[PDB]
């Protein structure tokens, strides 16, 4: 039965009861249902008015916080020398929630999610090696859907953005914040996708299109300065308007790759493959036991 | 126009702030909602589902051997089986439970807890157990006559396989804290000891070693407050393929 | 009263004299796709009694050193009966499932089985960065075996697996466990061959043992689709 619960439940006083045929402390775990034994039935209690609020464990309050999705540093200089593996004052990031484990493990507590992505870009500039000063630069962040044609150059004509949504901001200005809606072609996102995307058998396991927000292209609009700088862009995402379904077990072992769920485990407990909880001497041993 | 002035805290980015921001896609229409089973609106729904405690955490136990507690016949009366440290937010057996993982995101916790043990021995196996709960301030009781002075239940094997041990909420404060001193008066929950009431008697044909499965859930008076980060996960390096997203 | 149970759907019927209060996942019961949730305009086909019935899979031996068994749905059923034919001729499907697992032993045997249906189970791999392959994930009717059931092969915890729809088979208490699964997915319908909505797991939480003369203990799973629908009629892709 669904109900509106704004606070923890009250406790009622119980008296001494010995009755045949009534066994409130017995249950059957084989049913899969959780034990319904009440504290009033197990022992003898007093009347308590419980005013503790449940509001802070709400999935809206729980899941919605600004967490770092991506952090990316690159050099700002004349790139006519450095090779192609280095960044040429732009970088393209495919938007994913799996890069950092604090937000990842927290979003993997549920099978499906429906939420709006509130994005924030925070930029920090430094000076490469004598000191000069921190310039005020204008950075463009253009939102490119997955699979579209992304800019190949800082000065390329792809940045005109007559259609793709863009945003302009300065280092001195407050961080730029936009709200990305819920774009999944389905009714919610699949945090875990069991299957393949493609009709051929060569597809990727667990990699699902329509769960990717898209590509985020960031450049430094200003032309390169006579002295090489170093710019670091940090992107934070806060979910909002959240609906969550089918809670899952929290992941114990550390993550390995963002593309899959593959596990390894530490060398020894805690969070080892064979032992999740650290080992004690024996089942009768109490590690923190008081001694006086 | 309207004369204004800035306040301390203007232009700052607070990760927990609640504000409306500029929509990136104008006139966008999200996909219609479809009914999906098992919606979780509040995280206290999850902690109320019983999950397996790992009591056997020790050496010489690998993998799934850690989720059960072996019970055998004994030649001496009044013997101890196992003891469970009750701190949820430490590294003890309660760490990996549903109630344990969700509670390690929060600093303060309140409300009653319940343990449930399911006897997996053969149908011909008989026995009686006593599940004792000792409030804090003392040492872990090593004897039954010292342990039965606290909240307990005496359990006899039968048709119903499971007994539920309520752990009541007993504190001088409304909440307890995670803080990494285990012996602090605001943290330590006390102890749980299990003794043989009578004995485990099995026929010669049945297996002499029988196992129990510890479960723990949270009641509907349970509460959590002051969210924090979870120590249960962390990374010293960038994950694999994280660089490939920048290609 | 909740001990004996009979399930009659289709031309097949299953009786069990030891059962506990069959589990209905998330309180939801299978039903056909309503008119307001329907994306596809073409008239769907509802074989009813043809595709809704118990399909018994191949029994697996239960032995002390057993690490557990898993079956993915619909994938386990795609080769079987008239349900397997509608899967091949039809682009889309929507159905719920009814799981019934049979394991029996003498009153002198001890053991426990966690029978759980994991929605959207994404399997991992131990000590490698390589994603699992197509034949590793898709086992057909035979089904696979857990490499590390302690972590559920996905890196999560087996201790918390009770958050999913589940029952137990405790050789003392009951000889069977029944789970009723509705349609779980983000999409209203789905392509049968690539995507699997459910993964049925049978895990030896408590190992088998006895001092009686050793015998073979099978574990049988009978899976019944419910409220099947199919769209996109074409030639059989198989």
């Amino acid at each position, epitope marked *: 039965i669904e109900s509106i619960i704004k606070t923890a439940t009250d406790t009622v006083k119980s008296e001494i009861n010995a009755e045949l045929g009534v066994v409130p402390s017995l249950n059957a775990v084989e049913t899969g249902a959780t034990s319904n034994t009440e504290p009033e039935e197990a022992i003898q209690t007093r009347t308590v008015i419980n005013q503790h609020g449940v509001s802070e464990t709400l999935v809206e309050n729980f899941l919605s916080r600004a967490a770092l999705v991506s952090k990316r540093s690159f050099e700002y200089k004349d790139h006519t020398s450095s090779t*192609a593996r280095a960044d040429k004052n732009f970088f393209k990031w495919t938007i994913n929630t799996r890069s950092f484990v604090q937000l990842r493990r927290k979003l993997e507590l549920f099978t499906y999610l429906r939420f709006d992505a509130e994005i924030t870009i925070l930029t920090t500039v430094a000076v490469n090696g004598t000191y000069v000063g921190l310039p005020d630069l204008t950075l463009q962040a253009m939102f490119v859907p997955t699979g579209a044609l992304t800019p190949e150059k800082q000065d390329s004509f792809h940045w005109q953005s007559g259609s793709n949504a863009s945003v302009f901001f300065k280092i001195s200005d407050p961080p730029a914040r936009i709200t990305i809606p819920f774009m999944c072609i389905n009714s919610a996102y699949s945090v875990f996708y069991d299957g393949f995307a493609g009709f051929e058998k*060569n597809g990727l396991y667990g990699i699902n299109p329509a769960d990717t927000i898209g590509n985020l292209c960031v450049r430094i609009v200003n032309e390169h300065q006579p002295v090489g700088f170093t710019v670091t862009v940090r992107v934070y995402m806060k979910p909002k308007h959240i609906k969550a379904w089918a809670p899952r077990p929290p992941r114990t072992l550390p993550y390995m790759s963002i593309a899959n769920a593959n596990y390894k485990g530490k060398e020894r407990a805690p969070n080892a493959l064979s032992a999740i909880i650290g080992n004690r001497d024996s089942v009768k041993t109490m590690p923190h036991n008081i001694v006086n | 126009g309207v004369p204004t002035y800035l306040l301390p805290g203007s232009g700052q980015f607070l990760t927990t702030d609640d504000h409306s921001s500029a929509p990136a896609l104008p006139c966008f229409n999200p996909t219609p909602e479809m009914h999906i089973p098992g919606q979780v609106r509040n995280m206290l729904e999850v902690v109320q589902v019983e999950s397996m405690m790992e009591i056997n955490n020790t050496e010489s136990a690998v993998g799934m051997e850690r989720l059960k507690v072996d019970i055998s016949a004994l030649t001496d009366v009044d013997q101890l089986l196992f003891n469970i440290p009750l701190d949820i937010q430490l590294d003890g057996p309660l760490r990996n439970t549903l109630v344990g993982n969700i509670s390690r995101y929060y600093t303060h916790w309140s409300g009653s807890l319940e343990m449930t043990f399911m006897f997996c021995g053969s149908f011909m196996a008989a026995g009686k157990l006593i599940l004792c709960y000792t409030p804090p301030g003392g040492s872990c009781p090593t004897t039954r006559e010292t342990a039965m002075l606290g909240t307990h239940i005496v359990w006899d094997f039968g048709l119903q396989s499971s007994v539920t041990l309520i752990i009541p909420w007993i504190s001088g404060s409304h909440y307890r804290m995670f803080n990494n001193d285990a012996k602090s008066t605001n943290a330590n929950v006390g102890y749980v000891t299990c003794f043989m009431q009578t004995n485990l008697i099995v026929p010669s044909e049945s297996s002499d070693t029988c196992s129990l499965i510890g479960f723990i859930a949270a009641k509907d008076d349970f509460s959590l407050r002051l969210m924090r980060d979870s120590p249960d996960i962390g990374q010293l390096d960038h994950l694999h*393929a994280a*660089e490939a997203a920048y290609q | 009263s909740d001990r004996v149970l009979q399930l009659k759907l289709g031309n097949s019927a299953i009786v069990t004299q030891e059962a506990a209060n069959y589990c209905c996942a998330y309180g939801e019961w299978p039903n056909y796709l309503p008119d307001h949730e329907a994306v596809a305009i073409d008239k769907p086909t509802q074989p009813e009694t043809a595709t809704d019935r118990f399909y018994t899979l191949k029994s697996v031996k239960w032995e002390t050193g057993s690490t557990g068994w898993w079956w993915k749905l619909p994938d386990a059923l795609n080769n079987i009966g008239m349900f397997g034919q509608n899967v091949q001729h039809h682009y889309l499907y929507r159905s719920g499932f009814l799981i019934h697992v049979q394991c029996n032993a003498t009153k002198f045997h001890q053991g426990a089985l966690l029978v759980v249906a994991i929605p959207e189970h994404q399997r991992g791999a131990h000590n490698t960065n*390589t*994603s699992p392959g197509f034949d590793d994930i898709m086992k057909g009717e035979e089904g696979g075996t857990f490499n590390h059931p302690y972590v559920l092969d996905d890196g999560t915890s087996l201790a918390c697996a009770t958050i999913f729809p589940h029952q137990w088979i405790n050789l003392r208490t009951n000889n069977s466990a029944t789970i009723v699964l509705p349609w779980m997915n983000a999409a209203p319908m789905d392509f049968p061959l690539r995507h699997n909505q459910w993964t049925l797991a049978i895990i030896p939480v408590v190992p088998l043992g006895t001092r009686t003369t050793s015998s073979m203990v099978p574990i049988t799973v009978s899976i019944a689709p419910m409220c099947c629908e199919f769209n996109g009629l074409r030639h059989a892709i198989t």
Partner: antibody
Amino acid sequence: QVQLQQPGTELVRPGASVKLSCKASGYSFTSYWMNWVKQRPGQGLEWIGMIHPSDSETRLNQRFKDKATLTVDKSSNTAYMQLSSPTSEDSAVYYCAREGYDYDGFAYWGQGTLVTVSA
Amino acid sequence: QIVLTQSPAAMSASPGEKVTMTCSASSSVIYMYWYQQKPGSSPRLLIYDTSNLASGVPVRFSGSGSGTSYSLTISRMEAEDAATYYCQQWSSFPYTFGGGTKLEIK
């Protein structure tokens, strides 16, 4: 520093049991995998499968899984490779290789052995 | 089984010229790996993760590409560089290899 010592040419028979070892030195034998690759004359390379010496866990290619089985020894630090039913297709050059210390893709290779099937 | 198409199957180049190869994949992989196998020797790893160079690999070698298309680049060709070339995928099982590229110095 690491040296993978592999035997030389071995003549086999049509349906005998092929016995192929691989040697390891300069690194912990149980800390990494062992990977086997075949080379046909004037042909591309194909990957047979892997085995992990720690728990003796193996993972094989879907095609060669039935025609090959792997075995490891931690004491002698020697990994074994066994084939079944040698035929004209089984004549090839076999390499035993392992992952790089942080890099992927078989940075350390073997010296190879030339299998000659005759009847 | 992702099929890796290594194109072209053969090429000819003079010492100092720039040679470029393309490894096409039947699906989208993540990182691309590259090998050299001499005339009668064992293979060697050169480019891993489509960026870095392994030990003993001169700076002349290079690699790039993303999505389903990956390429190898050699700035200045040398006569000692004639051998077969392969491309590997780490993304899915089984590990699959390219068709091979044979080249000589004219």
